[PDB]
Structure 1
Amino acid sequence: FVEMVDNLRGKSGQGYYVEMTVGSPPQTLNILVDTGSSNFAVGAAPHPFLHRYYQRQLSSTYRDLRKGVYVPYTQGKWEGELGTDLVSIPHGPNVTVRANIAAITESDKFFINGSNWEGILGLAYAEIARPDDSLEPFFDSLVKQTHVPNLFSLQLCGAASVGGSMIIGGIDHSLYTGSLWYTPIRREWYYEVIIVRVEINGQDLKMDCKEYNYDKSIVDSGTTNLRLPKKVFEAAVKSIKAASSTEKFPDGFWLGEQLVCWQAGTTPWNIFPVISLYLMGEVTNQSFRITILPQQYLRPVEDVATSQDDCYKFAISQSSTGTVMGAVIMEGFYVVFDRARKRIGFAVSACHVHDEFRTAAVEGPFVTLDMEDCGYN
């Protein structure tokens, strides 16, 4: 699996992309890796933000499905024309599959100005595919047409340029330390999991655990932040705020409405607490926990044109859509999307960013009762 190591690039807050080829002869595109959606969709027109786009006219293996897709979201949208064509991943398995492609022909606040990707690879399940679950997702097609085993894994490193590895069809042991711990995929739509307990600096929030998963908890490489349900967020921040009394900050900061700054090399990591999420284990009444550092949830914004020092953003935020374990979580861990066994494994990432004092951890087993009551129905 050494061919796939380091096959992911990106810029902070702009996601992780992999090189892909579409059509015959192959057209190289950089494609956002997204475990929180299930469409393979590529820019297919000269939007001014795009370095490159899919030119169906140049492809002998293109086939129109003569159906459109309209994909609205709160701040924007994309739409496109459905088709299929031959797809390959240069630094992935040595195969070529016929996949669905949404050729993107109009969009609003989708593509990022200054980014180096031109499409999105939705790695989640058909249930949430658009326009409906009849549109076979890429990975489903990959597995159905090849002998590539039904799993993939992600090491998102986050260092400006981030990097990482998407290991398709397996697991690379060099990408992590200690052991993998698995949590069940509750339902195959998003990569949905159940959080059974939350601690900040070891002290737990003492919240009905159903609040942690109202109405979903998901693993999502397409989101930057740790997103927590409102009631869990206010509780989490309240405790994070108290753990961090040594120094004071505006309320806007905790709402990601402002950023905070220190002098270069003078950021006080240790005034900020670790965050622990306990996940439902593979066995009745058994859990494990993952622990992240502030280096994960205070993410550096050097991007500031109106400043020149160590400024960071608070990378935890409220959500109406449930818990989202985004890059804030995923950058601590090697993450194994074990589709064959309906489970996600977490291990400590060989590449995560830590100090000499504290470290990202994956620990078990723990005893936690009533773990299925934590799930929202």
Structure 2
Amino acid sequence: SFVEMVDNLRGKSGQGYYVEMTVGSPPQTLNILVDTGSSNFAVGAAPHPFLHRYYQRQLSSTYRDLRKGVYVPYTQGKWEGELGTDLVSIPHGPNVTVRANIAAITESDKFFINGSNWEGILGLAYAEIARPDDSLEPFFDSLVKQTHVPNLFSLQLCGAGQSEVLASVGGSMIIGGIDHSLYTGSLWYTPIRREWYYEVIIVRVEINGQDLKMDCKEYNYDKSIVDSGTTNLRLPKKVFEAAVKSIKAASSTEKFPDGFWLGEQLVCWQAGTTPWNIFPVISLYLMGEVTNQSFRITILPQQYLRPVEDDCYKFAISQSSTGTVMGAVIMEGFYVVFDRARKRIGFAVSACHVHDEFRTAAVEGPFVTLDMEDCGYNI
């Protein structure tokens, strides 16, 4: 924990959160997307039209070629690179330096985003999903192994709160501890089912207090994960359809185009007249540390209606064919502790949550649910 790590994240709405890092000797400054949905540390290392700077290995005295190729395909972006090791620091993180594996990006497609202000990505998940394979020690594992930094990190992603520019966002990545000033109320923990993605189990879903009443295996159909690198709440097909049906009904007083519900087309209102009260709250109940217990995290429309350029919003809930992805919009307004040491993820109401006059984002428990290990997908 540390006061000096507060507000060390920045970003543009919809384009992830990044932290400043240095690579090489002398230190080369780069902005790096913080991604709990992947396990590779990678940086642009060759010219690209959307990169204004990049990692130049030749300028680093501490660089070492691993003489090995590496490739990672994400949801739609992808890159190819060359492995190596170098000294890495996080100026606004812990006061330490570590020799980490680095994928030097030489080719890419739809990976770098025009005007995002980041030049690389920091995969914070486990070795099991790293490319080329699990022998390439992820950054966080190197940090804990080489230093005395406790095996734990927390993320406080904050919302937007202009005009023709994407809203700027901020947050905090607290490495090695829990900063108690970043949250209120109690921290509730859900088990990390398996150490590969940050996998969890959802046992119940409600929209405005109404249970979807689905077999809980559906909520984790495939898998459920906590992914700071994906913007939206992504839901498996059957859950998505049931959720949008209910959100439509709650906000039936008004009518929006199908494009809006499909996440692509935007929807606007005059400034300050956004009818937040017609959109329902969504509660995801996560499995507790104790069998038969659960806790819920409640999400407001201020989280799932993401603001965009020129008051305009996009529906930030979309369909998945690879499980539930609790992306940035779900993490916003919560303090999320990735307690790797004790294989669990904690949630607490964030100090930067969306107040709202009548409703608020919340973390509450316990709630007693008969049977929860049966909600998982058995390999």
Which category describes the TM-score, using the shorter chain as reference length? over 0.9
Q: In the alignment, which residue of structure 1 is the partner of 2:4?
A: 3
C-alpha displacement at 1:46, in angstroms? Answer: 1.5
Distance in 1, matches of 2:159 and 2:264, equals 23
- Find the residue that maps to 1:213 and give its secondary structure: coil
Alignment-derived partner of residue 24 in structure 2: 23
8 Å Cα contact 1:129-1:135 kept in structure 2: yes
Aligned partners of 2:159 and 2:333 also within 8 Å: no
Superposition deviation, residue 93 in structure 1:
0.5
Partner Cα separation in structure 1 for residue 73 and residue 34 of structure 2? 20
- Distance in 1, Cα, partners of 2:45 & 2:129: 22
Q: Deviations over 1:316-371 (max 9, x none)?
A: 00001100001110002000000000000000000012311110000000001110
CA distance in 2, matches of 1:184, 1:190: 12
| Cα distance, 1:311 vs structure 2 | 1.1
Asked if the contact 2:7–2:172 (Cα under 8 Å) also holds between the matched residues in 1, the reply is yes
- Alignment partner of 2:374: what SS? helix
Shift of 1:109: 0.4
| 1:292-314 deviation line (CA, Å, top 9, x unaligned) | 10000001112xxxxxx611000
Kindly provide the CA deviation profile for residues 205-246 of structure 1, in whole angstroms up to 9, marking residues without a partner as x.
Answer: 000000000101000000110000010000111111111111
Q: CA deviation at 1:74?
A: 5.7
CA contact (8 A) 1:29 1:53 kept: yes
Aligned-partner Cα distance in 2 for 1:324–1:311: 24
CA distance in 2, matches of 1:354, 1:224: 21
**Helix, strand or coil at the partner of 2:87:** strand
Q: CA deviation at 1:253?
A: 1.2
1:224 aligns with 2:225: no
Distance in structure 2 (CA, Å) of the matches to 1:48 and 1:251:
34
2:112 is paired with a residue of what secondary structure? coil
SS in 2 for 1:299: strand
Aligned pairs, how many? 371
Distance in 2 of aligned mates of 1:145 and 1:74: 32
Alignment check: 8 A CA contact 1:260 1:313 kept: yes
> Aligned-pair distance for 1:41?
0.2
Cα contact 1:33–1:121 (8 A) shared by 2: yes
What secondary structure sits across from 1:376 in the alignment? coil
Unaligned runs of 5+ in 1: 303-308
The CA deviation at 1:73 is 4.3
TM-fit CA distance, 1:266: 0.4
1:51 is displaced (CA, Å) by 2.1
Contact 2:155 2:337 in 1 (8 A): yes
Deviation at 1:76, TM superposition (A): 4.0
RMSD: 0.9
Please give the alpha-carbon distance, in whole angstroms, between the structure 2 residues aligned to 1:77 and 1:226: 21
- Structure 2: runs of 5 or more not aligned: 161-166
**What aligned pairs does 1:1-377 form with structure 2 within 5 A after superposition?**
1-73=2-74, 75-159=76-160, 160-302=167-309, 310-377=311-378
What is the CA–CA distance in structure 2 between the aligned matches of 1:12 and 1:73, rounded to whole Å? 19
C-alpha distance in 2 between matches for 1:129 and 1:274: 35
**TM-aligned CA deviation for residue 251 of structure 1:** 2.1
Q: How far apart are 1:171 and its partner, in Å? A: 0.7
Same amino acid, percent of matched pairs? 100
- Farther off after superposition, 124-133 or 250-259: 250-259
Q: Contact 1:293–1:354 at 8 Å: present in 2 too? A: no
Displacement of 1:269: 0.2
Please tell me whether the aligned partners of residues 337 and 344 of structure 1 are also in contact (alpha carbons under 8 angstroms).
yes
**Separation in structure 1 between the aligned mates of residue 252 and residue 306 of structure 2, nearest angstrom:** 20
1:114 Cα offset (Å): 1.1
Q: SS where residue 186 of structure 1 aligns?
A: coil
1:17 & 1:68 partners in 2: Cα distance?
A: 25
